[model samples]
Target: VQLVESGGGLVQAGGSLRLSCAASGRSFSRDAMGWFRQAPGKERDVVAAINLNGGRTYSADSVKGRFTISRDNDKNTVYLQMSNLKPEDTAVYYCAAREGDVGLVSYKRSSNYPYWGQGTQVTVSS
Candidate 1:
């Protein structure tokens, strides 16, 4: 499992970036990678995910353009990047394994990741 973050601790608000999270133990693109966030005192919540096959993106209503998700087929890795970094983006970002697609039939719902990386904490500081 791998977790990556922006080398720059600070980004101008409304800036864009292409952050990535990758895995090697198993097929990365074949599976699904879920993104989550843990606020100062709040629990974790699903932010969004990327469908490796269709290359589709799903994001929660709370975070739209502020965040972006991606996957690397060649390296078997998962990635997450947020544009327009704001105080709201400040938190511990996580990329977790979704369980296999036991319900849906398409590659979109083929699997659901049950495990997750150790997690990388990035605070949007000025």
Candidate 2:
């Protein structure tokens, strides 16, 4: 499996960025697709995700309605779109697919991440 983040390298706060994540080698919608984040000292954290089964979207408060997370199962691609960019948003964003075992399995722990994107760096400037 492979996850690759592409498009829009850098932009200023006044501008917006539309990043794309291409997924291949497995059923793109086999599990929930999520976006994770990492910065200098701050490590990884879950940004958002979409579950095709339930057709539900989970997102952090920071990105609630500002950032758009969508996927195209037909195209085997996931997208992270950002508007109202800010300097605080500079970070490497990764797109990944995750899975948990069948019933009796806990999703809060021991999740399986089959693939992660090379990471798309969105450097938001002042």
Candidate 3:
């Protein structure tokens, strides 16, 4: 499937969320997926994602517990699959990239993102 966006959240503490970081402009194998969060009108913070080739997942500087990233080579898409959603998880999320840096290698890995998608707001609802 080409990147699809479904915006809605659940109240339950433990559930599966399949947040997609769809790949369109670039070929899936040459790019990496980066998930970030932004409040209504604030700066974004990096979450985590799966690198293209290596299948290794990287989290931000100070994050812990209950998160995972996966990419479907067949579908040419990346997914941020998080189980157990908390109220704190509510935010406008975006999937970004450090272009040409397929894996956690090269200079972009040290710096922040260079390519980003429009933010998707997902508030936990009752």
Candidate 4:
């Protein structure tokens, strides 16, 4: 299965951004999905992840309280909602999926993201 992010190019600080991932030929609710972020010229960071089957979510320490991960099995889609955004929040977001739980509510072993989305670039400004 593959993930493609669709939504948002610009957002204001203190506002909110809703990014959606459409899965192709895959069962979103039957596996695990994760979200990662990469700054313009920096390394990628884990934003959060979810076990759709169990309705459990995990977020990075810096992302906790600001990022939310959810799914819609009917549409084979997953969503990443970020609230109270800041300038530093601007980045390219990617969605990834794996077959089984890597042993955590929101994490993958080796922190590897095998399946990647086309990436949605979000710019947070004042």
Candidate 5:
């Protein structure tokens, strides 16, 4: 899983939040990367994911247009940004590589969380 999600951040409620995940063992293009968040006492939710099915990005309805996923293909890093945050948005976020088996998207987007980044805590408040 050579993925390392680093650090926590403090952001005001009206701004944006950025989470980063670094991969040091494989090509990011090999699979799609997903962003998941688990608030302190809530179920985990998928924020968004990207670079699958010929360079497409999929986001959850909860965040919808407020979230964006990007990657540095030249290097090996994925970033997720969420806007219009509030205290309820605070959570431990992680980056995981979605695996398939073989195809355009390396198995074609199955339930793949075998390799994931360390959790990052983001606090959003007034």
Candidate 6:
């Protein structure tokens, strides 16, 4: 599986951006897709994700209202839409797909990401 990201690379506070993530070599609607962001000098943080089986969306508490995650099964694509952007939102964003058995067997800590995008660098400036 592969994830590719595309969209406006520049943004500004109070503005909005729409990013696209396209998947290949997998049944997109059959798996889970997660959107992550890494601020400078910070660890990766999950922004949003499409639930397994692909119907509903789940987002981080801080991003719940400002971020929207969705998927197009027919296009094998996922989207990340953010509004009311802030300068602090500047970061490198990535799209990743989860693989392996989950909740079917004993829960064990493992690498949920089997495929990931190279990451899109987003710069939010005045």
Q: What are the clashing pairs of model 3?
A: none
* TM-score, every prediction: 0.74, 0.82, 0.74, 0.89, 0.82, 0.84
Q: Candidate 4 residues 6-105, lDDT tens each?
A: 9868998999988999899655567778888889889888788887767788888877898897777778899999999999888988888887764454
- lDDT per residue, candidate 3, 1-126, as tens digits? 133444445545555577776666445465566777875677777778556756777776443466677776766667777767766777887877664444444322424566666667777654
Candidate 1 vs. true structure, TM-score: 0.74
Q: What is the lDDT, from 0 to 100, of the residue 49 in candidate 3? A: 59
lDDT of each: 0.61, 0.71, 0.63, 0.80, 0.73, 0.76
Q: Model 3: runs farther than 4 Å from truth? A: 1-11, 25-28, 61-63, 102-111
lDDT top scorer: 4
- Model 3 lDDT on a 0 to 1 scale: 0.63
lDDT by residue for model 1 over 28-91, one digit each (tens)? 5565566777778988776777666566667767777667776656767666777767777766
Report how far residue 23 has shifted in candidate 6, in Å.
0.4
TM-score for predicted model 5 compared with the true structure: 0.82
lDDT of 3 at 76: 61
lDDT of 2 by residue, 20-97 (tens): 888775555656677777876897776777665655666767877888877777787878887888787888888777
| TM-score rank order | 4, 6, 5, 2, 1, 3
What does candidate 5's lDDT look like per residue over 1-126, in tens digits? Answer: 478886468888878977778888654566777878889988767777776446577777788889887777666787887888878779988887756323334322335556677788998877
Every model: Cα RMSD to truth: 4.3, 3.5, 3.7, 1.9, 3.6, 3.5
User: Per-residue CA lDDT of candidate 6, range 1-126, in tens?
Assistant: 667899858898889999889887555557667778889999887777766573566677777799997667678888899999889889999887775323422111124666788899988887
Q: Which is better, 4 or 5, measured by TM-score?
A: 4
Over 4 Å off, model 2: 100-112
